[PDB]
Design a protein around this ligand. Structure first.
Ligand SMILES: [Zn+2]
Ligand SMILES: [Zn+2]
Lengths: 381, 381
């Protein structure tokens, strides 16, 4: 077989994830392909009678009717549905990709929103601090056999704080703390993640990189989504890649006796949990007081709480409630505790990485592949 | 049987809870009678292999070794043990009670620490807001069949914000939102709580009222406890009455098929969970930045985290992990969300009770038994 090495174009990448994910519940939605329709979720009254094994005992349980007790919360409202317009968004993106540039002017710029940041590897180190912090609040440990799943979280987090081109992400030009993306894929193989699970997580990452890049490369896209609230939420969940991170978290945390994690068999519960965590994050950040948001911000908040309570209740009865309830609601404890968000409250500064944290993070840095400008990161590690 | 109506003296109350609780793990400790020795707890390494039914999946899971990732957390340190001095504390209290006054000068004064508070029934209303807020974050609902268990939480919370004499608490002179203590006991009977469970919760409340009153009535007591850290913690857990509140929460939340909640059969897990919640509260309040604390506050914090992680790990394997893990760690999400603590951050003000919260709280007020000065509380309810 002749050795071909051409990096796919963004158009070909888009086509590839279209073919892999297929359509969601709307025809022509690929690759925006969720099967759960958030707008149709129903909330059932709680009878108060629960078995010890009931899923309500996992995660954080805050009933809808109790939310008025908390001033930072309140009442809920069903969101308007524009989800059936998804085919129009995909058609628009197909057209844009016929003449899209492979590079943007600000590629490589820091976008963390914290003026202290001047080195992109230092930003990656902070993102790695955050990635282990999320992993822990989801229920995970720091054992060495999950090293590369944690690196995956880092790759999922850094595109928000550093502008990365999908091409450079794919072809090894971009490195996260010295790691190429292929290093993560190869590492997941060394850890024993099945090839099918790796490729699902891989395609989710492709989709994240593409959708986040389109938001910056195509000036028509965000205006097109901003006015379609329910659709913007679908899109934001893809740019957050909570689904890909969840798949690998489940692989690390699931009962060994249980079979491998297949999205084909568990898409419903995984999608519900991925949406719940995104909504919880936005809930918690707003409540604490730290543009994609459109229209009346007060109404958008009532919609998030509507979605949150229904996502969480549905997760009560799902086969993996024992992981997905906590994944869905973890923002309620990780946002108040994590430096990432406390730094923003404190005038968007940077907390020092003390020696204990630095020693934890040291092994995640491939110092041999860093640029000379970054050889001195994590010095106390 | 001749009708006798004399209110017990504080000495007789003390004797009664001594006879009821008996000794803890130290001889002569009654009624400071915990059987678990916090100082002896051991932390086991996590193998990372867990069944779906493992208790680690309940509550919030933050491993000890991950805590350095969070600037507001850090490392841990084992506390020094003075628990075997408990007999000296009880002996001292026995002597003080031989000539103790039945009334203190500031009895009836507001002690909430929020200058806005001028009416003790309004303070009780705010405490009721908080009581339902704690109940919800523990996992409970607002269903009417748990009304009087929630009133119990209110009685457990108000002694911190209003100075109450044990005599007036007992004999019906003190009313919480128009409810006497006997009204709560009778209400718990109407709700179907077994007599033995009610009397356990009752004795826990007696013990809370006595121990909190002794701290103010006996100027020698706090100096005696302050220097015995591990003992002060035992005492503070009794003044918080997390054990009594837990017993009734479990009654409301437990599997119906399971038997009644008997402290005689479940004291170990209940004590561990009661300690964990108190330690979590203090952890979370300090981390957020809101005197019993003695010596080097930095060291005391390392001790709290030591106790927290060991309490939580032990709860993984207990029969009621499916309730007690969340009870133990709930402070990690209820402290950031509850008005009680947000008010203190905001210059110890009072957030308005909006119409939604007021409508929730209305049924907990017995307006027929309020003093005329308080007839206008919760007007929007
Ligand atoms: Zn919709
Ligand atoms: Zn001890």
């Amino acid at each position: 077989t002749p050795t071909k090495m051409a990096t796919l174009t963004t158009k070909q990448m888009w086509q590839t994830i279209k073919d892999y994910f297929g359509d969601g519940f709307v025809t022509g939605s690929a690759p925006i392909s969720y099967n759960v329709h958030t707008c149709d979720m129903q909330l059932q009254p709680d009878s108060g009678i629960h078995a010890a094994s009931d899923g309500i005992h996992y995660g954080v349980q805050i009933s809808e009717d109790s939310m008025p007790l908390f001033s930072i919360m309140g009442d809920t409202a069903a969101p308007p549905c524009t989800c059936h317009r998804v085919d129009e968004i995909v058609k628009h993106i197909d057209e844009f990709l016929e003449r899209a540039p492979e590079a943007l002017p600000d590629d490589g710029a820091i976008t963390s929103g914290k003026p202290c940041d001047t080195n992109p590897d230092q930003v990656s180190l902070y993102a790695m601090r955050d990635s282990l912090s999320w992993w822990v609040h989801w229920g995970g440990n720091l054992r060495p056999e999950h090293y590369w799943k944690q690196i995956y979280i880092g790759f999922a987090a850094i595109p928000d704080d550093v502008q990365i081109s999908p091409r450079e992400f794919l072809d090894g030009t971009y490195r996260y703390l010295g790691h190429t993306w292929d290093d993560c894929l190869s590492g997941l193989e060394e850890e024993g993640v099945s090839p099918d699970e790796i490729e699902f997580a891989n395609m989710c990452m492709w989709r994240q990189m593409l959708t986040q890049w389109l938001e910056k490369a195509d000036p028509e896209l965000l205006p097109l989504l901003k006015g379609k609230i329910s659709l913007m939420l679908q899109y934001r969940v893809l740019t957050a890649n909570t689904l890909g991170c969840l798949a690998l978290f489940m692989n690390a945390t699931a009962d060994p006796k249980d079979g491998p994690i297949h999205y084909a068999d568990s898409s419903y519960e995984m999608e519900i949990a991925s949406v719940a965590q995104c909504v919880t994050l936005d809930m918690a950040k707003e409540a604490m007081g730290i543009e994609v948001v459109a229209g009346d911000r007060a109404q958008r908040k009532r919609e998030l709480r509507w979605i949150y309570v229904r996502c969480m209740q549905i997760l009560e009865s799902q086969p993996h409630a024992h992981m997905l309830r906590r994944y869905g609601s973890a923002g309620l404890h990780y946002v108040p505790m994590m430096d990432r968000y406390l730094e923003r409250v404190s005038g968007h500064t940077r907390f020092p990485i003390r020696d204990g944290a630095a020693r934890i993070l040291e092994r995640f840095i491939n110092r041999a592949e860093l640029p000379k400008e970054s050889e001195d990161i994590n010095p106390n590690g």
